[PDB]
């Protein structure tokens, strides 16, 4: 029996900059109770029919967990075109696998505030599939130097997400996992 | 090829009121003199980024330019609300091209001050994207004819003393 | 220098129009916008509105359909106007001078204080 | 609407030792131009609120330099290097980015003795 209890059932998820990646195998696993499960919003994925994976024997499974706003969930799929999937997650075409989210909005709003799960803005220069990569730094154009944040000259590329008001159908804290086979 | 020399070294800039246009379309200019100048105090580009504007070809652009403060210069933007941006000059929400700006006290100055420059300060209602009116005449609840009848321009104060300096403000808009 | 200063009733009934002044003195005739302020008691402050020499206005959309306001240049004075009030507008009225007109919201120069009582 | 919120609500501060206020948004602050539109007043008790710092990196004309900001987007903060005697009262912060413009819940700084 395969333990996928505590990557489904985890306690910190790890930030969407810096998403943790496990290492599953050696074991079996049943996809029955994962499709069958209610309690999960949404399970829709490709390359592989989810009612044939009870037949499969695939090398080797990814565990990729982080976490996202309600907003731009859609954009976590290969082939498409926004602010973070161009930018901190990126899939390629060639992916299989699946993904699934699901609200988590018991246990992360309704305090003071949240500030946990940072993320970069719309800068840099774009993304690979696959990088996972970490060079926090300030730069900006327009023939600077580096000594601070200094609005009218830099900015500090990272900021924090929201989820404080109970207001936002897209703005709940969710959370996402994608398996790759 | 296109002489940006003529506007960007002219010997006197209209006033904001009434600032004198441009239009220059059939020649060859190179985006890289004005930009590698370090003369330039800002220097802000919108919808492109400064060094690719060599490989784009465009129909025309446009050559707008006036005098302002050094504190005022932030107005000139994409949809601020102040006394230039809603009563003068003012830039629309649409595409803009690349606004530029540098300190000119040097050849502005002395005891007289330059009362020659003038603005408008009692406009009645809000203007329209590049509206550039022209017109002299008093307002008031009074109905009276030809008159209680302050003039609607004043002149800018200017003098030898940090947010007051003369600038100068050229827009390049395409 | 710019010395503000309000004037006006303090106790008024409810459903009532409400009218108070604020003189400027000093510092005459200029392109700069005029705003005004409140705050109830024991809380947080609340803007209002703001208005431009010539007349034009925008103002807050809570408060959008029962409240006026107007200038004249001869008296250097500006009023406000708000009608049809209930016992929750009991509260403590400023009048500025930056206004916070969207685009820097500098607050240079406050009033002294004027409070106003709705009541029977 | 945006709501702005402070932390903390009180704060007891002995003299001589730096202190700091935050205060952080709910919607990004950053206009058109490069710059981020702040304010932060100061209530002294039995008086009117006056003006200690706009566009969150520049002072006002006459307070002492020893307030200062940082910070952009969504996050800034306020230091104070050294408290006074005078320096109790109830602190702001004001969005202007877009009208409404609305304050914060206040600050209340507290001096030891």
């Known amino acids: 029996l395969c333990p996928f209890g505590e990557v489904f059932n985890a306690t910190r998820f790890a930030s969407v900059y810096a998403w943790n990646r496990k290492r599953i195998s050696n074991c079996v696993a049943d996809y029955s109770v994962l499709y069958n499960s209610a309690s999960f919003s949404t399970f829709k994925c490709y390359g592989v029919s989810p009612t044939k994976l009870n037949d499969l024997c695939f090398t080797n499974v990814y565990a990729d967990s982080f976490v996202i706003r309600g907003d731009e969930v859609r954009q976590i799929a290969p082939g498409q075109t926004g602010k973070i999937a161009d930018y901190n997650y990126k899939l390629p075409d060639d992916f299989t696998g699946c993904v699934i989210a699901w609200n988590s909005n018991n246990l992360d709003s309704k305090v003071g505030g949240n500030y946990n799960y940072l993320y970069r803005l719309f800068r840099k220069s774009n993304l690979k599939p696959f990088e996972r990569d970490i060079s926090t730094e300030i730069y900006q154009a327009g023939s600077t130097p580096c000594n601070g944040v200094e609005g009218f000259n830099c900015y500090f590329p990272l900021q924090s997400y929201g989820f404080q008001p109970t207001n936002g159908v897209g703005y709940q804290p969710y959370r996402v996992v994608v398996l790759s086979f | 090829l296109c002489p940006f020399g003529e506007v960007f070294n002219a010997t006197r800039f209209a006033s904001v009121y009434a600032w004198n246009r441009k239009r220059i379309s059939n020649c060859v200019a190179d985006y890289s003199v004005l930009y590698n100048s370090a003369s330039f105090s800002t220097f802000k580009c919108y919808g492109v980024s400064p060094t690719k504007l060599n490989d784009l070809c465009f129909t025309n652009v446009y050559a707008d330019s006036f005098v302002i403060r050094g504190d005022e210069v932030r107005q000139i933007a994409p949809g601020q609300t102040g006394k230039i941006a809603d009563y003068n000059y003012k830039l629309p929400d649409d595409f803009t091209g690349c606004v530029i700006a540098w300190n000119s006290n040097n050849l502005d100055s002395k005891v007289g001050g330059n009362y020659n420059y003038l603005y408008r300060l009692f406009r009645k209602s809000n203007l329209k994207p590049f509206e550039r009116d022209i017109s002299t005449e008093i307002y008031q609840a009074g109905s009276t004819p030809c008159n209680n009848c302050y003039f609607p321009l004043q002149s800018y104060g200017f003098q030898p003393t940090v947010g007051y300096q003369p600038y100068r403000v050229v827009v390049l808009s395409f | 220098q710019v010395q503000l200063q309000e004037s006006g009733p303090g106790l008024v009934k409810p459903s009532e129009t409400l009218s108070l002044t604020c003189t400027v003195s000093?510092?005459?005739?200029?392109?700069?916008?005029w705003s005004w302020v409140r705050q109830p008691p024991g809380k947080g402050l609340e803007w209002i509105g703001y208005?431009?020499?010539?007349?034009?206005?925008n103002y807050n959309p809570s408060l959008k359909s029962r409240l006026t306001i107007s200038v004249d240049m001869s008296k250097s004075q500006f009023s406000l106007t708000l009608s049809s009030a209930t016992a929750a507008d009991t509260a403590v009225y400023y009048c500025?001078?930056?206004?916070?007109?969207?685009?820097?919201?500098?607050?240079?120069?406050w009033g002294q204080g004027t409070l106003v009582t709705v009541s029977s | 609407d945006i709501v702005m919120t402070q932390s903390p609500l009180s704060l007891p501060v002995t003299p001589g030792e730096p202190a700091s206020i935050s205060c952080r948004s709910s919607?990004?602050?950053?206009?058109?131009?490069?710059?981020?539109?702040l304010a932060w007043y100061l209530q002294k008790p039995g008086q009117s609120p006056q003006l200690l710092i706009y566009?969150?990196?520049t002072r006002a004309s006459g307070v002492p330099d020893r307030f200062s900001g940082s910070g952009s987007g969504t996050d800034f903060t306020l230091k104070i290097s050294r408290v006074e005697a005078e320096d109790v009262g109830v602190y702001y912060c004001?969005?202007?980015?877009?009208?409404?413009?609305?304050f914060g819940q206040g600050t209340r700084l507290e001096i030891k003795r």
């Open positions: 919607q990004s602050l950053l206009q058109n131009n490069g710059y981020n539109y």
């Open positions: 000093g510092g005459f005739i200029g392109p700069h916008y």
């Open positions: 208005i431009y020499i010539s007349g034009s206005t």
């Open positions: 566009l969150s990196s």
């Open positions: 004001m969005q202007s980015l877009q009208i409404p413009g609305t």
């Open positions: 500025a001078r930056g206004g916070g007109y969207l685009e820097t919201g500098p607050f240079e120069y």
